[PDB]
Every structure is written in C-alpha cells, then in structure tokens.
Enzyme design. Sequence first.
Site, PDB file in Angstrom:
ATOM      1  N   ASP D  57       0.825  -1.200   0.000  1.00 28.72           N
ATOM      2  CA  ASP D  57       0.000   0.000   0.000  1.00 28.72           C
ATOM      3  C   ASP D  57       0.863   1.255   0.000  1.00 28.72           C
ATOM      4  O   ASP D  57       1.952   1.291   0.577  1.00 28.72           O
ATOM      5  CB  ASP D  57      -0.932   0.005   1.209  1.00 28.72           C
ATOM      6  CG  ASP D  57      -0.216  -0.348   2.488  1.00 28.72           C
ATOM      7  OD1 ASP D  57       0.942  -0.803   2.404  1.00 28.72           O
ATOM      8  OD2 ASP D  57      -0.807  -0.169   3.572  1.00 28.72           O
ATOM      9  N   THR D  90      -5.231   4.809  -1.524  1.00 28.28           N
ATOM     10  CA  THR D  90      -4.059   5.669  -1.384  1.00 28.28           C
ATOM     11  C   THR D  90      -3.310   5.812  -2.704  1.00 28.28           C
ATOM     12  O   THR D  90      -3.034   6.930  -3.163  1.00 28.28           O
ATOM     13  CB  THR D  90      -3.134   5.109  -0.305  1.00 28.28           C
ATOM     14  OG1 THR D  90      -3.768   5.216   0.973  1.00 28.28           O
ATOM     15  CG2 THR D  90      -1.826   5.873  -0.284  1.00 28.28           C
ATOM     16  N   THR D  91      -2.975   4.685  -3.335  1.00 28.29           N
ATOM     17  CA  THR D  91      -2.229   4.736  -4.587  1.00 28.29           C
ATOM     18  C   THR D  91      -3.044   5.413  -5.681  1.00 28.29           C
ATOM     19  O   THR D  91      -2.502   6.180  -6.484  1.00 28.29           O
ATOM     20  CB  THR D  91      -1.813   3.327  -5.006  1.00 28.29           C
ATOM     21  OG1 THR D  91      -0.984   2.752  -3.988  1.00 28.29           O
ATOM     22  CG2 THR D  91      -1.038   3.365  -6.306  1.00 28.29           C
ATOM     23  N   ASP D 388      -7.471  -2.779   6.110  1.00 23.15           N
ATOM     24  CA  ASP D 388      -8.055  -2.253   4.878  1.00 23.15           C
ATOM     25  C   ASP D 388      -9.419  -2.879   4.606  1.00 23.15           C
ATOM     26  O   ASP D 388     -10.378  -2.177   4.255  1.00 23.15           O
ATOM     27  CB  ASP D 388      -7.110  -2.497   3.701  1.00 23.15           C
ATOM     28  CG  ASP D 388      -5.811  -1.717   3.819  1.00 23.15           C
ATOM     29  OD1 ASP D 388      -5.867  -0.492   4.055  1.00 23.15           O
ATOM     30  OD2 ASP D 388      -4.734  -2.329   3.669  1.00 23.15           O
TER      31      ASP D 388
HETATM   32  N1  LIG Z   1      -8.914  -8.320 -10.922  1.00 26.56           N
HETATM   33  C1  LIG Z   1      -8.827  -7.003 -11.231  1.00 26.56           C
HETATM   34  N2  LIG Z   1      -8.735  -6.604 -12.515  1.00 26.56           N
HETATM   35  C2  LIG Z   1      -8.643  -5.305 -12.840  1.00 26.56           C
HETATM   36  N3  LIG Z   1      -8.639  -4.302 -11.952  1.00 26.56           N
HETATM   37  C3  LIG Z   1      -8.729  -4.559 -10.631  1.00 26.56           C
HETATM   38  C4  LIG Z   1      -8.826  -5.955 -10.185  1.00 26.56           C
HETATM   39  N4  LIG Z   1      -8.898  -5.917  -8.843  1.00 26.56           N
HETATM   40  C5  LIG Z   1      -8.846  -4.614  -8.466  1.00 26.56           C
HETATM   41  N5  LIG Z   1      -8.745  -3.808  -9.534  1.00 26.56           N
HETATM   42  C6  LIG Z   1      -8.658  -2.330  -9.509  1.00 26.56           C
HETATM   43  O1  LIG Z   1      -7.444  -1.968  -8.854  1.00 26.56           O
HETATM   44  C7  LIG Z   1      -7.673  -0.982  -7.854  1.00 26.56           C
HETATM   45  C8  LIG Z   1      -7.155  -1.511  -6.528  1.00 26.56           C
HETATM   46  O2  LIG Z   1      -5.818  -1.078  -6.342  1.00 26.56           O
HETATM   47  P1  LIG Z   1      -5.273  -0.899  -4.846  1.00 26.56           P
HETATM   48  O3  LIG Z   1      -3.898  -1.511  -4.743  1.00 26.56           O
HETATM   49  O4  LIG Z   1      -6.379  -1.296  -3.901  1.00 26.56           O
HETATM   50  O5  LIG Z   1      -5.149   0.700  -4.804  1.00 26.56           O
HETATM   51  P2  LIG Z   1      -4.933   1.493  -3.426  1.00 26.56           P
HETATM   52  O6  LIG Z   1      -3.612   0.984  -2.911  1.00 26.56           O
HETATM   53  O7  LIG Z   1      -4.924   2.934  -3.865  1.00 26.56           O
HETATM   54  O8  LIG Z   1      -6.119   1.105  -2.583  1.00 26.56           O
HETATM   55  C9  LIG Z   1      -9.169  -0.735  -7.780  1.00 26.56           C
HETATM   56  O9  LIG Z   1      -9.455   0.590  -8.232  1.00 26.56           O
HETATM   57  C10 LIG Z   1      -9.805  -1.730  -8.721  1.00 26.56           C
HETATM   58  O10 LIG Z   1     -10.683  -1.032  -9.598  1.00 26.56           O
END
Ligand SMILES: Nc1ncnc2c1ncn2[C@@H]1O[C@H](COP(=O)(O)OP(=O)(O)O)[C@@H](O)[C@H]1O
Lengths: 532, 120, 189, 524
Positions: D57, D90-91, D388
Amino acid sequence: PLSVFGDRSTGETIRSQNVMAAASIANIVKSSLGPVGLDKMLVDDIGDVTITNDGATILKLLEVEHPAAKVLCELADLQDKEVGDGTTSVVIIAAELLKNADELVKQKIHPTSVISGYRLACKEAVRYINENLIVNTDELGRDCLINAAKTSMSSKIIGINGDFFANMVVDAVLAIKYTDIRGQPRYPVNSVNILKAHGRSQMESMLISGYALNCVVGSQGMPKRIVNAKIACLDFSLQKTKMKLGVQVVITDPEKLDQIRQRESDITKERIQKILATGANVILTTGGIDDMCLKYFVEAGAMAVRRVLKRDLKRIAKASGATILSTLANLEGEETFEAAMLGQAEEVVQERICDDELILIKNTKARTSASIILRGANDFMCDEMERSLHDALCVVKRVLESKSVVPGGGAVEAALSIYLENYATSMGSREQLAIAEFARSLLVIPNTLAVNAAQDSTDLVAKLRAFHNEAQVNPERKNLKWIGLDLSNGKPRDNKQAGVFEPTIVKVKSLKFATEAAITILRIDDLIKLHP
Amino acid sequence: QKSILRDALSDLALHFLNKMKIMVIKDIEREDIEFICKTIGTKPVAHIDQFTADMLGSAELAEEVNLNGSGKLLKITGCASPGKTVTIVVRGSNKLVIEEAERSIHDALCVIRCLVKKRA
Amino acid sequence: KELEEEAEEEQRILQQSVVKTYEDMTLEELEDHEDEFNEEDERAIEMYRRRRLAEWKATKLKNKFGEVLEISGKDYVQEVTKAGEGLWVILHLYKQGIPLCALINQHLSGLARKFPDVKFIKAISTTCIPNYPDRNLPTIFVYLEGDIKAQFIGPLVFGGMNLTRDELEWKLSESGAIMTDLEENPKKP
Amino acid sequence: PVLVLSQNTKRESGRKVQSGNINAAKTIADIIRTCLGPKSMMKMLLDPMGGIVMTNDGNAILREIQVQHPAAKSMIEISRTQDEEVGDGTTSVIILAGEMLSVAEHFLEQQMHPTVVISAYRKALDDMISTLKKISIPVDISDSDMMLNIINSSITTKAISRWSSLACNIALDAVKMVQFEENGRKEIDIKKYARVEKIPGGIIEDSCVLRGVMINKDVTHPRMRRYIKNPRIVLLDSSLEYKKGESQTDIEITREEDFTRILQMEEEYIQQLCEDIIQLKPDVVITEKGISDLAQHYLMRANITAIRRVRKTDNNRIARACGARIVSRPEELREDDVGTGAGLLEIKKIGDEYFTFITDCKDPKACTILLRGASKEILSEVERNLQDAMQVCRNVLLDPQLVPGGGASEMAVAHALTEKSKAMTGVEQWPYRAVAQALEVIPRTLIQNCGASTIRLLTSLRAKHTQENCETWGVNGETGTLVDMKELGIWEPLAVKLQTYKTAVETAVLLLRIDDIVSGHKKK
Ligand SMILES: Nc1ncnc2c1ncn2[C@@H]1O[C@H](COP(=O)(O)OP(=O)(O)O)[C@@H](O)[C@H]1O
Ligand SMILES: Nc1ncnc2c1ncn2[C@@H]1O[C@H](COP(=O)(O)OP(=O)(O)O)[C@@H](O)[C@H]1O
Ligand SMILES: [Mg+2]
Ligand SMILES: [Mg+2]
C-alpha cells in the site's frame, strides 16, 4: 573624529538604504496581492511548511534585521489587529509612497515640506472618501455582506468557492448578535470556534448551529449522546481533596485513621451527588477528573468532559445560559447546587471526524451560537482556509458595524489619485509638490493588480484615470466614479453594479497608518548602529 | 493591592465578590497607591475593622475600555473630589513614534514648568 | 492520557529519549510494572532490588533535618563549622527587608521540606556578623565543611524580584550541592 | 554587514518554482506507480530504527519516506489523509494527483494563469462527483454473499489475497460484531473495540476472530483455576493494596500497642475490601492495578481468579464484550456491574507464553483476532490488509452504494464529462478535457502493470466505452483483457472513489496555486 565605537550612515546614504529596505519588503509581499496574485509557501529551519497568502502571516513568519522594514512589518501587524483586511495593501501603499517621497527629497526639497504635504493629503483623502465615495449598506440587505465576504475571499484558497462559503460566513456572524448599551448591536467575532479536519472536500465544511468543543468523553463507558442536555459548567478539578499546603493531619491513635481516609474521597463523592441531585446531564469542567468521579458519572448515565479550555467553557456557558462555578459555596456556610444554574442544550453528541471524535453541542437554549468546521485535503490547506475565513469574518463584522462600503478593485485609489492631482492647487505653495506625489502614489494598488494578471497595466490605469476625470468634471457622469479594473477581460467595469465592495474602515485605516509609518520612517537623517 | 507572599485574591473570595455583583481589580503596585489616593480620593485600608464608608473614594463612572482590539484600559472618570492630578494616554502606529511623542510631550511640559518657575 | 495501546506506548518510550532499559527505576514503577520483566533473570532483578533498598534506607537514615532552623551569633560557630562530617549548610543571612528576604524565606522552607538531606540555617545580619553592611540584602554564604563553597550577595546575582520556586535549587546546586531533579540552566526564563 | 532579511533566508520565484512543484509531485507519483493493481509488486523499506516494512500500500511506503521538498511533504500528508479518512485508495489518489499536476504544467507553460486552471479543476471535480454518483448501484447489506464479494474486491490486490476466502470472513465478523447502538441514536463502528494481535509462528489460516477477548496475561496465583466454565467477571480500575493517600499524615506512636495495631489495620482494610468484592459472588476479577498478597489470598479463599494489571484499552474492550462495567470503589460494586454472558474463560499456553481468552461470550461488542502467521513482518502486512478490509466493510455498511472497479468507473466519468465539455465554449474547456484524460491514468497503470500493451488495449477500451451503456466495462488485470465488470464481479464503495477524486483535485489546487518560496529562518 567621533568616538562612538559604531557605524554612522549620514545623509542620502541612509535615506536610500531605508527606501531600499522598504521596497524590498514591499516587493516581497506584492506578488500575493489581488484576486489574481498567487500565494507563498514558507518553509522553516526545522522544515514545517505553511501555505499563506495574507501579508501579516508572511511578515510575522519572516525575520527582518532592518528597522526601516521592521516598521513595515509592525504596520502590517497593526493593520491585521485593527481591521483584519488589507494587510498587503497598506504595506504596498506605505513603501511606495515612501519611495516617491525620497525621490522628491532627492531634488533638495526639505523633508518637512513633504511630511506636511503627506499629512494634508491624507486628511483631504479621508475627507473625500467619507463624503463622495461611500454607499450605505441599508437598502442592500443580506447581499452586501455576501459580496464583501466574496471579494475578501476571492484572493484566497477558497475564492470561487465563495458562494458556498460567503453565505455560511454571514450566517456565523448573524449567530453572534449581541446587545451592550441597549440600542447598539455588537458582533463579538472570534466567538465562533473554527475547527480543523482533513477529511472530505471543501463542500463538506460544517456550519454547526451550536458550539463544537474539541474534546472527548472522559471515559469510554459513558454514553456518547444525550437526548436533552442539562449542562453543568464547572471550573474546579474533581479529584480527591488533598487538604492544603498549610493544613496537615497528625494521627495519635490508629482507631481514628481509616475513617479520615474515607472522607478523603467522600467529600468529592458528595459534591457529585449534589451536581447530580438536580438532574444534570452533561458535565464540563476545566480541571481534571479522577477515575472514581468518572465511575460516578458513568453509573449516573451522564457524560462528563475534563480539561475543557477556559475560553471554550466561557462561550458554552454564555450560549447555553449555564453559570460557570469556581466552587460550590453559597451565601451561607454550606455547599449547595441549584437547578437555576444548569444550561439547556437540545443535543450533545460525540461526532466522529476524519480520524478522531469531537463533541457537538447543538441548539443551546439561551442564545443561538455557531461554530465552523473546515474540511480540507491536508493540514496546510485547512489552516490557510482558516486564515481566509477569519479575514472574511472580520470583513463582514466591519461591514455590519459600520454600515458603509466603498467600491473595490482600485476604484477608491484611482479616484483619490485624480482628486489629489486636481488638489494641491488650493494652497499654491511649494509643499503642493508633495501632495502631487501622494496622488501618484495612490496609483500603486491598481497598477500591481494588472501586473499580477499579466495585463497591460499602463492602458488600464490610463482608462481608469480618464473615466474618473470624466466623472469629476461632469456632474451628470458621477456614476462613472464607481469603476474599477476587471481581470476576466481586462476591462474597467462599474464595480458598484458588479458587486465588489470593501468596508471603508479598511481604506481609511490603511491610509492613515501608511502615511504615519512613512512619516516616522522619513524623519530619519542618519543611522548610528552600535557594536554588540 | 499587589501582595507577594500571600495571594491577595483566592478563588473562593473572588467567587463571593462576583456573587455580590462587584468589580474586583488586583495586582496594583505599591508605588501607585499614593497616585491613586491623590487622584480618586480613597485612603489605604490595612485592617478590616478600619474599612468604612468615611474613607471610601467615589467616582461618577468606572469603565473597562477596549482600544479597538489593541489592548484594554481601566478608566475612572468623574471623581467627586478632583485632585491635583491628570493623566495622558497616547496612541501610535509603532513603538518608536509613541516614544518620541512621549518625549515631545514631556519637553512641552518642562517648558511650561520653566515658565511657571520664573515668569520671563 | 493513557488511552494508548502497546504499539503507541512503545512509540512514546522510543521517542522520549531512547528507552527505560529495565535498569533505571525507583521503588515505585519497577514495583508497579512487576510483570513486563522477563523471568529468566529473577536473581539479577532481586539483587538490584536489594541494593536499591539498601540505598533507600541509607538515604532515609541521613535525611533527618526537614526544615530550616534559625540561629544567632552564639551557636553560629558550631553550625558553620561543627555542622558535621559530609554535611554542608546554607547560612541565609537575612533582615526584615521585604522583597528578597521575604521571597527567599518562603522558598527555603519549601526547599528544606523537599530536601531533608541538607542543613538549612538562617540568621539575622545584625547579630550574626558585627556591623554587616546591610546593603547586600540577600546573603547565602554556603559552607562545605567550614570553608567557602559559594556566595550570593547581590540581588542582581539572583536576578531581583523575578525569582521562581525551584531555580534557587539550581543556584545552590551549581556549587556542588545535592543533585537536582530538574533540567535547564536558568529554569527556562 | 548590511542586510534587510536574514542572512540565511533564500527566495525563489517565477515559473521555475512552479515547475519544481509539479516535478516534486511527479517524483512522489513515480515511486509507487508499480504498486497499483492485482498484479502489484512488494516493496521493502528499511526503518531508521532497524526494522523492515515489506508492504504494497502507498501510505505504508510514504510514511517511511522523508522529503525536504515541501511539495512532496504535502503529497505525503495527502497519502496519510486518504489512509485515515477511508482506509483505501491511497495509490489511486496519489497517482491521480500526480497526473493532474503533470497535465496542468502544460497549460502553465502556455502563458495561462493558474487561476483559470484551478477554476476548471474545481468544475471538473464537481462534474465527476455528479457522474460518479450517477452510475452507482445499491448493495444489499443483509446479503452476506455480496459483502464477502466486496471485501474480496478490496483484498484481491494485497499479499493475503491467497487466503481471501478466509480473510474476508474474519473482517466481516469483526465489523458485524462491533456494530452498536448508542444512547438512542448514534450508531457507531469503531476499531478501538476490534483488536488485532500478532502471534508469530504457526499457520496463516489458523488465524480466526474470537467470539470475545484475548489478552496476554496470566493468573495471579498458581492455585487459582485456569479453566472457568461460566465466569461472573467483575472489572476493577483501582488498586487492591494499601496506599498512603494524598495528604501528609505522619502518624505519631507513643504507646506499645499502636504499631502492630496499625499493621493489623492495614490487613483488616484489605480484608474488608476483599469481602466487599466477594459478597456479590463473582468468579473472575480483572484489575488495572496491582493486587496485594492478602488481596489475592482472600479472593482465592472464595474461589475467584484474579488477573493483575491490564492496560486500560484491554479492560475497556473486555467490558464491552462481557457487558460488564468498570468500578473503582469496590464497596459500590453493583449487581448490574457484574459481567455475565462470558461463555468460557481459558488460560491457554501458546509457545512459551500464557494467553487468557474470555471467548464464547454471548452477543459481544468487542473482538480480538488471533492472527497467527510465520513472521513479524508477514503478520504486520496481514493485519494491515485486514485493517483495509475492515475499513472497506465499514464504508459499505455506512454507504449502500457501489461503483465498478478496474478503471471502469474512471473511464466512464472521463467520457461523460468529456461529452459534457464538448458542448461548452471558452478557454476553460481545455483544462476540463485535460482533467478528463487525467482520470485515465489508472486504467493505463493497470494495463502497464499486468504486462500488456497499453496503446491498443486502452484505445479499444476508450472506443468501445462510448456507446450503449457500457459504463461498467473495464480492464481485467489478471489476464490483461477488456471485460465487463459485472461478469468479473469487482466493485468498490462509492465513498472511496469520491474521496479519492476529491482529494486528488484538492491537492492539485493546493500545489498549483503556489508561485513563491522563502526557505530558511527562525520558527517565529
Ligand atoms: N482483478 C482485477 N482486474 C482489474 N482491476 C482490478 C482488479 N482488482 C482490483 N482492480 C482495480 O485496482 C484498484 C485496486 O488497487 P489498490 O492496490 O487497492 O489501490 P490502493 O492501494 O490505492 O487502494 C481498484 O481501483 C480496482 O478497480
Ligand atoms: N473580484 C475582484 N475583482 C476585482 N478586484 C478585486 C476582487 N476581489 C478583490 N479585489 C481587490 O484586490 C485588492 C487586494 O485585496 P487582498 O489582497 O485580497 O486583501 P489583503 O490586502 O488583505 O490581502 C483589494 O483592494 C480589492 O479591491
Ligand atoms: Mg485580503
Ligand atoms: Mg485497495
């Protein structure tokens, strides 16, 4: 020669040095002026950063080691204290007209003459502002305040958001109506508590119709919401009663020992029942509360808040009708608590915020109060929003107390400049030159405005001068006198009809303060700096 | 009066005074008591039994004045026994002009003093 | 206050200076924690406890004064010279001058109460020293055994009226008196 | 010599500093651009104190980074803001802010004043919030299947994804066990009453949330029973030994029968306190302070198990679980303050430590997660992912809305406000479309992370995402393909997305309004 053991700078040298220092401060603060000038970003030695736009904060954070600039910084601070707006404008005016006056002195005109010219010009300018440049905020109601707040917040981080802010801003001020001498309304600003939070966007800032102290319930087990709050403001700690610095117990027989120990708590306990014998439902105290008293409060079903700030508790007591008590002692020799000294609040809730919890006291019975919570992206944005909100509240207060405003956007400065140039023909003396210079000095504020917007400032100020000339030399064209430059198309527009107004207090105080600062820094003939 | 070694005001005492709807002012320097007595007409009291109305100064008005958010002052106006004493309050933008105004006013007062001393 | 968890408590103890390192407590908090200490070194902690108990009883054995005793010129020689081995005195020479004698007199009682380990004696200047100048109104002439150890004669040395409760502790201790539980040279301001 | 400002004061002004600010944000947006997506890559951080943080994260990456550039300091504060407010995204928000500044720099160079860019950014933010609320779909709270699906969507991009079918359940249980009704109104969901505790060594799927409370304490005395079937727990805040008090007493003794009488008085006081506790018949006593030897003796004679000093937070969660109440003065220990409902109390041994469980309690309002893994860092990452998931579950229980994931919602709102901007006219339309294509980075980031070519894939996505209500079409980052998110079944709370957009646009405004820097001076 002289045996002073110090450095002497005499004549034109020290005058030029003082003018250079004043110009340096003016140029530092000048880039952040007007609805187009941006803001500055100060980082300290340790590293903490503040994002600021108002001149007072910039000049206080900065450290200056020249008296001719320390006076300008003090002028900015004084303008902030007395009025609250126009902190950059007054510094710009003072430094620029000081530069003009030094230019005048360079032609071997005595500085007494230029000081007299500045004094007379300031008096005449104030008179003209009072007579032929103000409009009463009586026919315009509930909208002049909104326009004043909007134009005060335009240059800040919440500029175009003003429609959402200005409205609620005036509401806060309209919640602090007060009566002092039975016929003079009073607006004690700084009684609206401003809270910081770094959660949602700017639209989520909260205007609470009741005080919102930033504390937490004493113990977790105590209820966090009260349907009908009987607040009992206190000003003494609920801890075990240690006897005194002078009084000290001495035991001769142990049979009498344990009993006094019980008393060491029971006194406190007794007080609590008295406070709870009248149905008190919320307890606020500036002093601490020990664990046992928290247990009493949680078993009684009433929430208690400890270490409440004195100003917060004072405002809560004033708004809710409660009476703050330093101690429980009536006109007799016995402790007592009366139901007549409990404030009534329609609700008291510990509301969660971005990460923490803060207590809202909603709908206090005695008199309406208000508080503001600012939500932003991070701490710096929130604190800049708080500073801008303070400026807006000050502007609205000044407008409401003194029901008179003047057109903004350099209208008053251009009008005064053209009038003072048309002035100085009354006396006909050499001192008139000073007055003329003063006139040109009052052209600094519009100019720098168009300088910040990358607009052709010479043409704009020439057009403003021409329009005000037409207004002054033609009686039927008086409506032209309420005109100032505009940034959306670089055009002189009637700001009275456009909705850009500033309280006359700002202009008058800025003019007087600037001219006296210039006088007190212009009298210098030589500087004698002694060795540390 | 400002009394070191013994808190001249206690929380209980101030509470009682405020309950009786009175105004209380503390931390008065020992060097100003003569000036206060000559101005408003009070007489110092060091014992409770000697505290009576025969030695209690009177004034038409007592006010706590705010100077537009730049401090606070106490003003006693309309003393029924106007003594040979007046006070001057000065206003200014920065400290330097205030000090210079004080010096100029003092010089004017000294000039009037010289004119009073010998009449020439 | 204490609404902080194990991780927060560790963060606080690391941020304060470094760590308490389970070796620098008094009979209060090493007794009250009583459970964080691991059990494989019971002998070491018990030996430390016995040595600290011996230190506490030794300190309480020599803490027998408690309050200032005031003397005249008669016995002044004995309490300035024959006060005892390993003991030093204060010798506050005072008069009925209000400001400095009054403040120091009120503060020395508290210091003696909170330091029952060092002798406090106060004497009046008229009958302790023959015809003392009396202009230097304060006079704390500290004697280590019978010789000079320190001297404070002028109100400027103390700083005038602006005397707090506990900076006198540092002022006396800088000459080599009993240690202080307080930091900073001029007690902040 | 002669100076106006301080000697050490430095000043910077003009477009130069503006560029620097933008660049700073981009650098912060460059460190953790590879951590976004189900195919993310772990990063190892070396603490100054000697520890190691092995995490994915963004917030856990930035909190360990110190930057002297104040714009990067603002970006780190934004990351912490997003972590604290919602707990997710966050990302996404950091990348969005970085790309918004990167695209505003282009307009800054073309002699355009920042104020019009700020106005266009605010308008774009309002419109994207509107159209993001437009495409939302409700979620059935009572349906546990959809709750597990949402937690799976929130957990599929972390290190514990392989145990998702377990982890989701854990989170759900905890979030559905803290849900409480306060006095009248004020429903709450607080994680102070949901403790996660790490016990290194064991099996990851052995971790489970206990129907009660676990603390790391031991029974005060060996003879006290370590297995209590149906405890009646009384919670104590004060101490159970003899204390001096507050005032100075200094008892004086002149007779022969006062010293021993004083000591017997202390003993009888302890006896009286213990008898006051005993008379109401408890079975387990929990105290935040010490226990005297006489105290535990008298309690033991009544067959009571005593647990010595317990941290206040643990006592609070124990009270919330068992339904008991903390009392400081034992003589006021009421019947209603006795905790009944604890289904079992057990003093178990794990590794070489004693752990006390108050599990099996009826309808608890506090939970403890026995999180057993392989290492301290592994468990730290697992509990971060659990936090989370808990935050996402709380967000969706407090907000019954949902929005498509995988960059589908971002592309949808981008196209919607692009079509909105295609009608208006002025100079602010260009920054409007700049923001429109700025929200496009995260789909591109996903396509780049999965290893596929972003040009043709994203071109096809944008082209097909224009007609016939395809707003739910996004990218599958596991196979790097274009899918309809309804079949893939990944949805995210509307609160997280709207908070992300708001925070990104506001950070862009904050770092775009600035044109001067004064560095180096005293604090005040
Ligand atoms: N299997 C998947 N295929 C495509 N996109 C995905 C999948 N799973 C999650 N996502 C996308 O990736 C993002 C999740 O990234 P994440 O690492 O949770 O970001 P952050 O660290 O900002 O929370 C979400 O916006 C979601 O739409
Ligand atoms: N919307 C606007 N249009 C034109 N001029 C404005 C507008 N808002 C403010 N101004 C002008 O900008 C000038 C500078 O005000 P500002 O710098 O914001 O106050 P301060 O000097 O307290 O920082 C004011 O004199 C005002 O007349
Ligand atoms: Mg302003
Ligand atoms: Mg996520």
